Design an enzyme around this catalytic site. Structure first.
Site, short mmCIF file in Angstrom:
data_model
loop_
_atom_site.label_atom_id
_atom_site.label_comp_id
_atom_site.label_asym_id
_atom_site.label_seq_id
_atom_site.Cartn_x
_atom_site.Cartn_y
_atom_site.Cartn_z
N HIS A 172 0.85 -1.18 0.00
CA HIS A 172 0.00 0.00 0.00
C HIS A 172 0.89 1.24 0.00
CE1 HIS A 172 -3.92 1.89 1.48
NE2 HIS A 172 -3.07 2.89 1.35
N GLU A 242 -10.08 -5.56 2.53
CA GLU A 242 -8.65 -5.29 2.64
C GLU A 242 -8.11 -5.74 3.99
OE1 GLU A 242 -6.63 -1.09 3.08
OE2 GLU A 242 -6.47 -1.74 0.97
N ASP A 265 -0.41 6.80 -5.80
CA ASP A 265 -1.37 7.90 -5.85
C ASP A 265 -0.52 9.17 -5.90
OD1 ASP A 265 -3.21 9.95 -5.37
OD2 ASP A 265 -4.38 8.76 -3.94
#
Length: 284
Positions: A172, A242, A265
């Protein structure tokens, strides 16, 4: 059975010079962590093409999220598994809103309709249920590997066979540099997703995982079953499937881990020096 690789000319790997000195490139259980500079894609492409590998890509696009499909698919065509056989499975409530995207040779798309569910509980479990419960025989017959990704994303650079392995998760992008106590694991012991503060290797993002069909079905079945137990016990894990994916990957170590090049991102996190490529990124 695997035939011989052909003669290939490439730079000699040098034992006394690492590819990357700034990052961990192998986990403590000896799974590669995939960063730019760690792989020769020509060797990997040879290995996987010789097996006539077919990769299935599953993506859910519900309600307003159908608007993301056009860019998702067009950019997948430029960057995802080019040269290999690809089968996209688009799960949607609006088959008519799926854009007609032009596909390269050896690539196909199936539109799969979902599935009712007025209660949010079932919506939460829908992806895990659909990959394991309803699509089992279909995937086993059609593809060698399954990759499960979110739709509100675009490919910006190569994502290829370097990711393929029996089971993988992706770091992540908000947590790759974090201490485990900061990971947003489910922390309540009443949840099947529970992970104590002194456990955890990585925080994996639900937006990109995969592996062989068998291993992905095992993961999704286990997560779906665990989610049903939580629902019966009146608890919803902090980050839904998740949280379960993280519990599963703690107890069943993935055989490769993808670096955040594979789920980034840029609006939220910029472009740090540690990332030589931004491959698959959130749409702003």
């Amino acid at each position: 059975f695997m035939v011989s690789l052909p003669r290939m000319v490439y730079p000699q790997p040098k034992v006394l010079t690492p590819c990357r000195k700034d990052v961990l490139v192998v986990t403590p259980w000896l799974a590669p962590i995939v960063w730019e500079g760690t792989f020769n894609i020509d060797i990997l492409n040879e290995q996987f093409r010789l097996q006539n590998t077919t990769i299935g890509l599953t993506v859910f696009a519900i309600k307003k999220y159908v608007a993301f499909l056009k860019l998702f698919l067009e950019t997948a065509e430029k960057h995802f598994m080019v040269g290999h056989r690809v089968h996209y499975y688009v799960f949607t409530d609006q088959p008519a809103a799926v854009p007609r995207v032009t596909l390269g040779t050896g690539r196909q798309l199936s539109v799969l309709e979902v599935r009712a569910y007025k209660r949010w509980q079932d919506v939460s479990m829908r992806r895990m249920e659909m990959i394991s419960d309803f699509c089992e025989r279909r995937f086993l017959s059609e593809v060698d590997y399954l990759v499960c990704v979110d739709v509100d994303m675009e490919f910006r650079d190569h994502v290829g066979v370097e990711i393929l392995t029996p089971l993988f998760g992706t770091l992540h992008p908000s947590f790759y540099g974090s201490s485990r106590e900061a990971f947003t694991y489910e922390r309540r012991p009443q949840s099947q997703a529970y992970i104590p503060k002194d456990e955890g290797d990585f925080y994996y993002m639900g937006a990109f995982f995969g592996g062989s069909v068998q291993e992905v079905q095992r993961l999704t079945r286990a997560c779906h079953q665990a989610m049903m137990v939580d629902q019966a016990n009146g608890i919803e894990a902090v980050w839904h499937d998740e949280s379960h994916l993280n519990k599963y990957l703690l107890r069943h170590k993935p055989t490769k881990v993808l670096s955040p090049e594979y789920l980034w991102d840029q609006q939220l996190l910029g472009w740090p020096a540690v990332l030589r490529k931004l491959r698959f990124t959130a749409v702003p």
